[PDB]
Amino acid sequence: LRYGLLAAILGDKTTKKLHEYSRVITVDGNICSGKNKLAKEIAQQLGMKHYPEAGIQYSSTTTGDGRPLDIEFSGSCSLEKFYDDPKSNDGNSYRLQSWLYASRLLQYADALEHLLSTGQGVVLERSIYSDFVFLEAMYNQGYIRKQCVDHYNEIKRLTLPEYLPPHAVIYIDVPVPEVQSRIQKKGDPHEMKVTSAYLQDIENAYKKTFLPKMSEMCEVLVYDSWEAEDPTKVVEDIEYLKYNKGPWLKQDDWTFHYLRMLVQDKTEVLNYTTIPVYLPEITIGAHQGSRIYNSFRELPGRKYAPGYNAEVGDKWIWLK
Amino acid sequence: ARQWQPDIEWAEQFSGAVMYPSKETAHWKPPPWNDVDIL
Amino acid sequence: QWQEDPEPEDENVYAKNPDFHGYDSDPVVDVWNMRAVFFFGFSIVLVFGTTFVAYVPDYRMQEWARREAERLVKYREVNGLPIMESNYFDPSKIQLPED
Amino acid sequence: FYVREPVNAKPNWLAVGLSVGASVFMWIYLIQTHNEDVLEYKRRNG
Amino acid sequence: MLKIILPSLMLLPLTWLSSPKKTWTNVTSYSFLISLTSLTLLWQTDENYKNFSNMFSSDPLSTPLIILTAWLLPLMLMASQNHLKKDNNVLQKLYISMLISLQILLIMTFSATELIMFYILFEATLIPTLIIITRWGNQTERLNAGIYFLFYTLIGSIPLLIALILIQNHVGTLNLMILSFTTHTLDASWSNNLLWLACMMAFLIKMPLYGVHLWLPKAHVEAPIAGSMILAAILLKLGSYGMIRISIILDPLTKYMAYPFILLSLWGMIMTSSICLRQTDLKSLIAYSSVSHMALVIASIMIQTPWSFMGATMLMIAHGLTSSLLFCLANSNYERIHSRTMIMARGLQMVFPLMATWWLMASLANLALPPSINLMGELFITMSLFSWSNFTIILMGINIIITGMYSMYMIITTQRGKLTNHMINLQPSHTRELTLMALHMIPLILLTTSPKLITGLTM
Amino acid sequence: LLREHWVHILVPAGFVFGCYLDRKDDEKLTAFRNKSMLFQRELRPNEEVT
Amino acid sequence: MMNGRPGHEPLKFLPDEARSLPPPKLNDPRLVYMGLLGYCTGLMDNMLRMRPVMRAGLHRQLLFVTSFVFAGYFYLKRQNYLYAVKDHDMFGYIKLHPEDFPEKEKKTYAEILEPFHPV
Amino acid sequence: VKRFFESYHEVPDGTQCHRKTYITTALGGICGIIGSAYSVSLNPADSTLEAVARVGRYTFTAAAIGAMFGLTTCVSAQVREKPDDPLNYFIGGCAGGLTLGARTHSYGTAAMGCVYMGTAAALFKIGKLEGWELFPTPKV
Amino acid sequence: LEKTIPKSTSTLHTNMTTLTTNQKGLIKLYFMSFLINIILIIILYSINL
Amino acid sequence: DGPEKNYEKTLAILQIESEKAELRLKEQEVRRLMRARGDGPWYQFPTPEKEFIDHSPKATPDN
Amino acid sequence: MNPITLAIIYFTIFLGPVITMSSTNLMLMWVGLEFSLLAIIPMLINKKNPRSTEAATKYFVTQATASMIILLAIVLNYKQLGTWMFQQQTNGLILNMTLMALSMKLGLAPFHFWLPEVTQGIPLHMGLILLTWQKIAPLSILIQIYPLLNSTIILMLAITSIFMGAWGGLNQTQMRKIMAYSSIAHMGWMLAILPYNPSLTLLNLMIYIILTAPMFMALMLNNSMTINSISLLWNKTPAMLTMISLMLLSLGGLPPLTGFLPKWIIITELMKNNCLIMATLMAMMALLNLFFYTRLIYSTSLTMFPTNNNSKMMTHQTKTKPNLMFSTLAIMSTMTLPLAPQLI
Amino acid sequence: PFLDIQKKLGISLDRHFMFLSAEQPYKNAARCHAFEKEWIECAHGIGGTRAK
Numbered sequence A: 001l002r003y004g005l006l007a008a009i010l011g012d013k014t015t016k017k018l019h020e021y022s023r024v025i026t027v028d029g030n031i032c033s034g035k036n037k038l039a040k041e042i043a044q045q046l047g048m049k050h051y052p053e054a055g056i057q058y059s060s061t062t063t064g065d066g067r068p069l070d071i072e073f074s075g076s077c078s079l080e081k082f083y084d085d086p087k088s089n090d091g092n093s094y095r096l097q098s099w100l101y102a103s104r105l106l107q108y109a110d111a112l113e114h115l116l117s118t119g120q121g122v123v124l125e126r127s128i129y130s131d132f133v134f135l136e137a138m139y140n141q142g143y144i145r146k147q148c149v150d151h152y153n154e155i156k157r158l159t160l161p162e163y164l165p166p167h168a169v170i171y172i173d174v175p176v177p178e179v180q181s182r183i184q185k186k187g188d189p190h191e192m193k194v195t196s197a198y199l200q201d202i203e204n205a206y207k208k209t210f211l212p213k214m215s216e217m218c219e220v221l222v223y224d225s226w227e228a229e230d231p232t233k234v235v236e237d238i239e240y241l242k243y244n245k246g247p248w249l250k251q252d253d254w255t256f257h258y259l260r261m262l263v264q265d266k267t268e269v270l271n272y273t274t275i276p277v278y279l280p281e282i283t284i285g286a287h288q289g290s291r292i293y294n295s296f297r298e299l300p301g302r303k304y305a306p307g308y309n310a311e312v313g314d315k316w317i318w319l320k
Numbered sequence B: 001a002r003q004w005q006p007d008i009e010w011a012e013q014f015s016g017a018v019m020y021p022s023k024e025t026a027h028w029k030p031p032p033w034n035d036v037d038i039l
Numbered sequence C: 001q002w003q004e005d006p007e008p009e010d011e012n013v014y015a016k017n018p019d020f021h022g023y024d025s026d027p028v029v030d031v032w033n034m035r036a037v038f039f040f041g042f043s044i045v046l047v048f049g050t051t052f053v054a055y056v057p058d059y060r061m062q063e064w065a066r067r068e069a070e071r072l073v074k075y076r077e078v079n080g081l082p083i084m085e086s087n088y089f090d091p092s093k094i095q096l097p098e099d
Numbered sequence D: 001f002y003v004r005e006p007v008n009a010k011p012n013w014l015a016v017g018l019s020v021g022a023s024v025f026m027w028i029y030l031i032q033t034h035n036e037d038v039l040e041y042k043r044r045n046g
Numbered sequence E: 001m002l003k004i005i006l007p008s009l010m011l012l013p014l015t016w017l018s019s020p021k022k023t024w025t026n027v028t029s030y031s032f033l034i035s036l037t038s039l040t041l042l043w044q045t046d047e048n049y050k051n052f053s054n055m056f057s058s059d060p061l062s063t064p065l066i067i068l069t070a071w072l073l074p075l076m077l078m079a080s081q082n083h084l085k086k087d088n089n090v091l092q093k094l095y096i097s098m099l100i101s102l103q104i105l106l107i108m109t110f111s112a113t114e115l116i117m118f119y120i121l122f123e124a125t126l127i128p129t130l131i132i133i134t135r136w137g138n139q140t141e142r143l144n145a146g147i148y149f150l151f152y153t154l155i156g157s158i159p160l161l162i163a164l165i166l167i168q169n170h171v172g173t174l175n176l177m178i179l180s181f182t183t184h185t186l187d188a189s190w191s192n193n194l195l196w197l198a199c200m201m202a203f204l205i206k207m208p209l210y211g212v213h214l215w216l217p218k219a220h221v222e223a224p225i226a227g228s229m230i231l232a233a234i235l236l237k238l239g240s241y242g243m244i245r246i247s248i249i250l251d252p253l254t255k256y257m258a259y260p261f262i263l264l265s266l267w268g269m270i271m272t273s274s275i276c277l278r279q280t281d282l283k284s285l286i287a288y289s290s291v292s293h294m295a296l297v298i299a300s301i302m303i304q305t306p307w308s309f310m311g312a313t314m315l316m317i318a319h320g321l322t323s324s325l326l327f328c329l330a331n332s333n334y335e336r337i338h339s340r341t342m343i344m345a346r347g348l349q350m351v352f353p354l355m356a357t358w359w360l361m362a363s364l365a366n367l368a369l370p371p372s373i374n375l376m377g378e379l380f381i382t383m384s385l386f387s388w389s390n391f392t393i394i395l396m397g398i399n400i401i402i403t404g405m406y407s408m409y410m411i412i413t414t415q416r417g418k419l420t421n422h423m424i425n426l427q428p429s430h431t432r433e434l435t436l437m438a439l440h441m442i443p444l445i446l447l448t449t450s451p452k453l454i455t456g457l458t459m
Numbered sequence F: 001l002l003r004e005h006w007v008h009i010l011v012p013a014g015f016v017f018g019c020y021l022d023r024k025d026d027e028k029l030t031a032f033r034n035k036s037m038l039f040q041r042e043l044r045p046n047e048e049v050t
Numbered sequence G: 001m002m003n004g005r006p007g008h009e010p011l012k013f014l015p016d017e018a019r020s021l022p023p024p025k026l027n028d029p030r031l032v033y034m035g036l037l038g039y040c041t042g043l044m045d046n047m048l049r050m051r052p053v054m055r056a057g058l059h060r061q062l063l064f065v066t067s068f069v070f071a072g073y074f075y076l077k078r079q080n081y082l083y084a085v086k087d088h089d090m091f092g093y094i095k096l097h098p099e100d101f102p103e104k105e106k107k108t109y110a111e112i113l114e115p116f117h118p119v
Numbered sequence H: 001v002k003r004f005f006e007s008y009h010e011v012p013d014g015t016q017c018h019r020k021t022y023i024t025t026a027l028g029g030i031c032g033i034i035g036s037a038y039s040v041s042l043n044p045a046d047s048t049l050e051a052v053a054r055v056g057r058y059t060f061t062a063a064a065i066g067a068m069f070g071l072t073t074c075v076s077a078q079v080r081e082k083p084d085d086p087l088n089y090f091i092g093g094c095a096g097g098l099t100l101g102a103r104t105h106s107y108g109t110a111a112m113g114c115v116y117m118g119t120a121a122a123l124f125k126i127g128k129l130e131g132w133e134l135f136p137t138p139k140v
Numbered sequence I: 001l002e003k004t005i006p007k008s009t010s011t012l013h014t015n016m017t018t019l020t021t022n023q024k025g026l027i028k029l030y031f032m033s034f035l036i037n038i039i040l041i042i043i044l045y046s047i048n049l
Numbered sequence J: 001d002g003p004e005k006n007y008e009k010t011l012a013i014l015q016i017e018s019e020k021a022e023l024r025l026k027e028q029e030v031r032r033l034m035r036a037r038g039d040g041p042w043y044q045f046p047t048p049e050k051e052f053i054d055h056s057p058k059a060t061p062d063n
Numbered sequence K: 001m002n003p004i005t006l007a008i009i010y011f012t013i014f015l016g017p018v019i020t021m022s023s024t025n026l027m028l029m030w031v032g033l034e035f036s037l038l039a040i041i042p043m044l045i046n047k048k049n050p051r052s053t054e055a056a057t058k059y060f061v062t063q064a065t066a067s068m069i070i071l072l073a074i075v076l077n078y079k080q081l082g083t084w085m086f087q088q089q090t091n092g093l094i095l096n097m098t099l100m101a102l103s104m105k106l107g108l109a110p111f112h113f114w115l116p117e118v119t120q121g122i123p124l125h126m127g128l129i130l131l132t133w134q135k136i137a138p139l140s141i142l143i144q145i146y147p148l149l150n151s152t153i154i155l156m157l158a159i160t161s162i163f164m165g166a167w168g169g170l171n172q173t174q175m176r177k178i179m180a181y182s183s184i185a186h187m188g189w190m191l192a193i194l195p196y197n198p199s200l201t202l203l204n205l206m207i208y209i210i211l212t213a214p215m216f217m218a219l220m221l222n223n224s225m226t227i228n229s230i231s232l233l234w235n236k237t238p239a240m241l242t243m244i245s246l247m248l249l250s251l252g253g254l255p256p257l258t259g260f261l262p263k264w265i266i267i268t269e270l271m272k273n274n275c276l277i278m279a280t281l282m283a284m285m286a287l288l289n290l291f292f293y294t295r296l297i298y299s300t301s302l303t304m305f306p307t308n309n310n311s312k313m314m315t316h317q318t319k320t321k322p323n324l325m326f327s328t329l330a331i332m333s334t335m336t337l338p339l340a341p342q343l344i
Numbered sequence L: 001p002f003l004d005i006q007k008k009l010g011i012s013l014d015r016h017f018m019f020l021s022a023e024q025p026y027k028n029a030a031r032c033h034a035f036e037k038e039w040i041e042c043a044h045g046i047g048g049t050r051a052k
């Protein structure tokens, strides 16, 4: 039976499973730093799980048959077009920032429920606590308006405080010329059109807001490229880490229960992302919306509810 | 042509604290979406 | 500005269905719909409706009334009585108030 | 084919059985009650 | 009656569990069969009326309204078909269900015996009309139009309910023909005058009096074609039926508590026939035509003579058919040009040489060309009002003139000039809409041949 | 074929149900069956007039 | 109103004074309407849970119909009992107070002069 | 003791004009006092002087309404021997609305109040005559 | 015919709406109003009696 | 069928409705009398229960 | 909040009105009212935000003053007659003070100013209870003494309530304040019909409850506490419009729907009692409730408002919220007019 | 009351110490015992309108 008051009363509690390494860690940094590699290695060396970075298709991949969907069904935004033509009169910039915040929030929730039902800690990439750097960069560069910025901050205020922050925040520090070199080497005709001004605004946002804001409630670990790539140092630092100064000690079985309900209900997560503030950059018209929704429901495995689509191999639909 | 559907101009008139703001004492502003005031 | 689809464009139907009839794009469905209309509205209702209504007899007694009026006129003109009196009800059974 | 195999992937046979039994018992009790009430009415009125 | 209502109730499942390709066809065919079956009511071999139950009844006045209601349905089905064609199967099934519900409720309220059942149905007729007008209109003032319609109606209907309760208490029933075999004269007091006002204003609003006609033109101009048709044909007749049924107990007050409405009707007749000369919207023109025609019905109910009631019924049915026809004719163009402006499109009768005939005959009727039931009604209303007072003929003639003017104006500014050669989008005439017009006309020919089914209670 | 042509049994079934309910309604209201001061017959050819 | 009357049992659905009335028949239009409402509740539950309307939850729909008919039968018995009791008391009072319910002196239209009103 | 307001209906209209006007004026004053108390407790003012000025405004306004209504009614009944005619009360209500519009400086309010108060007073008189009861006791 | 009937209705009801919904969440004022109500009721009773 | 069926059916409908009307107008007045006299089974408002009064000696003769 | 605390608080919330309705002693009735208050405050204040604290404070103060006045009435009756129950001999002032107190407990005008503020500051599942379950004990206490009340003040209160409810709902853009004013109006109808027939007060009570519960559930589905938030329902959950519209029309009191019958039969009784002028005023002023319900039916079901983007992911996600009671109550509340003779 | 569950179950939680003529602990008489007893006994069975 579903999780609820009854399960928590019967024994599906939380504190019976918080073994050390039942933590949640972030591996933030600039764009082309070794986050994926380092995070996979940390996950392996600590037994924890890895949740890769979340992009425009995270929901399309986590829901349904798992395959992606057209961008009009998932996002109507494009990082390629953002790198090619920012300042566009379309809205791709903020229409992408908002969708990416939403996907990072859905991911934070999908990780918290896993961590609370199972003591298996999780390791993520950039989260809802750092998504805003790519927004401040665009605002200081002129790709976005203060109205979009205020809308973003409002949704952040409505969403973030209802969630527990990370235990450990690893910041891989790297400078902008090395970043540009790494971009040119990796190879992307669009990422290779980005600007060192944008990259430096990202770095400055990080060092001036994220680090201070987060060193007061979670253990920070700042490393450079060469301390990174020698991870065992990082892993042993984490293992030695002291875990005070956070709210995770003010939490009892029942706070965990009332947080697990939220994290398990994937609509009270986004109710506030779905507020009707009418920005010309996300305000979709009725005709477009109706067309897109009816086509989405025309697609397979999406017309009815999960266990009620025979066209994908569902039987007993007349008794469930 | 096609059916006319409301626009931002038509939907933002239901977005104030109260409708019919013919008052001049109604300096109010919409409440929060989560009932947590700003401080 | 804001996100919305662009106004659509006019659409000739005869281009693809020169045998169009007005109901549906699918030609067979168009044809069977017009056929059902013509066979249920014209061939049946108007025809059989008109027939039944025309052969409804003695609508509201307008015929029995004429027959009976002829009978009455005969009876009365034969027995010297008048064809119609000035008081429907016989003033005998009636009992007027005395001022 | 889904990736979050849900609670509704297969039916709750306990719920099915209880529902069907409750329906059948409702109808049986209703028929019996109706017949008994008719018998009592006719006993009382002749 | 139940053999008429149960199948109309079954048209709903048919509509919903019919495939997305045969629902229109099946529901239209069966609606036609319903129209056919409804002719049992015309088997009136005696002056006794029909009584199938304590809840239903039929009369020579309710039978024609009922048959016109059962006939208009498939026509509205056919006419609402080109639009909402792209719209989803579910949405168009909703539309069909709205239409069918209107049919059923109108049949019920025409076959009713009790004033309060009549009331609940005459007030339930609002939901489907409001929904059709607001969910399938094309402008942005359809919302205000629905507001006006709904609230005019309700503001007029509340005091009617209160009067019905007062009666149900004084007398012990609201049943018709008992309210007749037991009716008493009144005291000519102010309480009874206000009772009169209450009983009447609801119907005097639902068929637009001159001063409260400000919901009909809106609703028409902003509503789709099926809504326009039903509003013009039957919703304007609910008031007439209600007044013809409720005026039997209000004696002898209407001898003097009717002058204001006779005046307003005979004047607004002129003052709307004249707007029909200088209005630019074809739909609003036809709406004001409906108003100028319902004014006669009002003034004829007010005077309570057999010829008057006969003309009222004839003109009711005739105007229903003719207004539906004219609305569908204007819709045929709208579907091609997306503009209700009349002077925009001209010089037709060149590419649409046949629809120019339907356009012409619908005009010959509206201007009362003999032999026709429009005229067989207007003439008797005129005679009744001339017996009332000989000075009414002046206003009657003025209205006749203005009608003959604006009908031919509507004809000539659309079909009898030279073409707007810049109109590439004049898709030829659909068999469907030609059939609409034919189904509207032919019954007028048949009712002109046999107008014994259309006189009413008196005759 | 049935899944697309079984919807032709509803509306005629409705007509028949309506006729049946009319029959019930007039099986009621039986009083005055021959007690009308105008149509008082003598039951010579049959046992029930209406 | 009718609560405080003699022979009034408190909080009882159906006394034995009601077992003498004729019971309702399951084909009663009101019971049929309650069954319709049950079916529509099932269909609406499916339509709200995004399931196939009319192709899901047959046990649920059956349960709905059965429960609705079950409640309707008993509630109908009770209401019939109440109306019968109302008539009973009313007629008893009428019979015990002949001084306030006198037979009207009904005349015939040949005597009472009703006024005439032309047109 | 509540007979101040009953002396109004012990004589046909057209008599005791002075005391009838006094009665309607007292009624206006009371209604205005209550309205002003409500509008002073809710939606208050800055200075007690402005508050008492609001009170005086409302009270004198309503008093004028009542005085003009009663006087016009009794004067119409005087100039025309019709003590049982609601048209007099309609005219009085229109005069009251006229005074309201003169005070508030708005022709809208003027005519609106005219029509409304006219209907109200005419229906009041119709009730007085026919036998209508407002706040009646249970009889079922 | 617009200025008179519907526009006048709308104006009247919108104005009375503003009047009655110009309230600020002040318990002092709400309770002063409650006190006026109590006084008016006591007076009605003691007067009519 | 013939017209006599509709004739007699109308007569029966009229009978039923007239009876209903008489019954309603008598109900009103019965309810009125009961509300105004408390002589019937309806509108019998409550009173204290005499079964909870004490009828035993009271430690003092005078009450 | 743990299970033991939840159980105790909700058992008290349930027990309060049960004692009130099952007790003959006015002291035990007062006890039940105090239980209700005590056990409701914590649920209001659960969120622990300034708005909830303020709402709780207002509720407490109002209800406590009202309870004190009720207890004064009881004590006065006790000194007057030696018994703990109101009889046909209590000084009418006692009963009018009691009526004022009960009206402030319910939320009737002009004792209503606290209800919208509190409901707004409060969440949805709490407004549901506050407006359905907390009207049953104070109404029961009145049903027990309906023969000995003052129709004058009752009708004044009822008509004031109708008027102010209409003129509030016309302006409010917030679901919860709209519900508050609708409650005010329906409670006014109840009070109006009370001294003539209380069975109809109970009828309208159950009708209003069946109509309000499913509406608050609909709202809680998306926590749409605003018009511009509930307009997106066509993209979030459009299978709820066919029922929101009908339930709102029923609330308004439209003929073919359950919600009509209360007004209709109440007007009938008032006519039998010659309260026609009041019935007319009320019937004409309910059309404003119908108006600002139609204005919502528009923004929800008859026209699509500008939607948002993340609503796409909201579509991606599934849901299991709306239990069977939603459908059951909505059907019972929209399609039960053919059964009015039984509900009467 | 409003819900006679007490009288249903034939018990007494609150309806035995309502008035003065009821049972006092050590048979101690109340002031108006006889007067109240007589009023109740005389109003029993004709409740309300008559007894007033």
Ligand SMILES: CCCCCCCCCCCCCCCCCC(=O)OC[C@H](COP(=O)(O)OCCN)OC(=O)CCCCCCCCCCCCCCCCC
Residues within 6 Å of the ligand: C045, C046, C049, C050, C051, C053, C054, C055, E035, E063, E064, E067, E068, E071, E317, E361, E364, E365, E369, E370, E371, E372, E443, E444, E445, E446, E447, E448, E449, E450, E452, E453, E454
């Ligand atoms: C009442 C409900 C109202 C609702 C309207 C909607 C109706 C939809 C249902 C379909 C119609 C059902 C039947 C309509 C009525 C048919 C009447 C009929 O059957 O004709 C009867 C007629 C003989 O009449 P009868 O009564 O038997 O004998 C006495 C003299 N009349 O015998 C005949 O004449 C039949 C032969 C028809 C021949 C037609 C020839 C046309 C002549 C041209 C006339 C032109 C007049 C109009 C010109 C101006 C019009 C703009």
Ligand SMILES: CCCCCCCCCCCCCCCCCC(=O)OC[C@H](COP(=O)(O)OCCN)OC(=O)CCCCCCCCCCCCCCCCC
Residues within 6 Å of the ligand: E155, E156, E159, E162, E163, E166, E191, E192, E193, E194, E195, E196, E197, E198, E201, H119, H123, H130, I005, I009, K276, K277, K280, K281, K284
């Ligand atoms: C924008 C327009 C304005 C919209 C706002 C509307 C405001 C409503 C008006 C305020 C209330 C005033 C009406 C008070 C009703 C008084 C009672 C009454 O008039 O009933 C008397 C009569 C029955 O009396 P009777 O049977 O003879 O014996 C005594 C009773 N047993 O029974 C009756 O006559 C019933 C009377 C019911 C009320 C009729 C209202 C006037 C009717 C004509 C106009 C209708 C249009 C809407 C109202 C317009 C403004 C009046």
Ligand SMILES: CCCCCCCCCCCCCCCCCC(=O)OC[C@H](COP(=O)(O)OCCN)OC(=O)CCCCCCCCCCCCCCCCC
Residues within 6 Å of the ligand: A290, A294, E088, E090, E091, E094, E097, E098, E101, E104, E105, E124, E127, E128, E131, G047, G053, K234, K238, K239, K240, K241, K242, K243, K245, K246, K256, K301
């Ligand atoms: C008989 C006597 C008459 C008595 C009086 C009768 C009163 C009038 C009856 C009124 C009944 C309807 C009133 C409420 C109107 C509801 C409006 C509505 O639901 O339509 C809007 C909406 C369109 O959604 P959209 O995004 O545009 O695209 C389609 C995707 N569903 O539609 C929806 O999205 C609906 C939700 C989609 C669910 C899947 C489709 C299943 C069907 C659901 C609709 C069922 C409606 C039943 C209609 C019966 C009519 C009697």
Ligand SMILES: Nc1ncnc2c1ncn2[C@@H]1O[C@H](COP(=O)(O)OP(=O)(O)OP(=O)(O)O)[C@@H](O)[C@H]1O
Residues within 6 Å of the ligand: A030, A031, A032, A033, A034, A035, A036, A037, A053, A079, A097, A100, A131, A134, A191
């Ligand atoms: N909120 C955001 N706004 C704009 N761009 C973003 C945002 N989040 C991520 N991106 C883009 O996504 C890309 C991430 O590439 P990245 O170099 O992180 O690949 P990776 O798989 O994480 O490899 P590594 O872990 O070694 O960096 C960057 O180019 C960055 O610009």
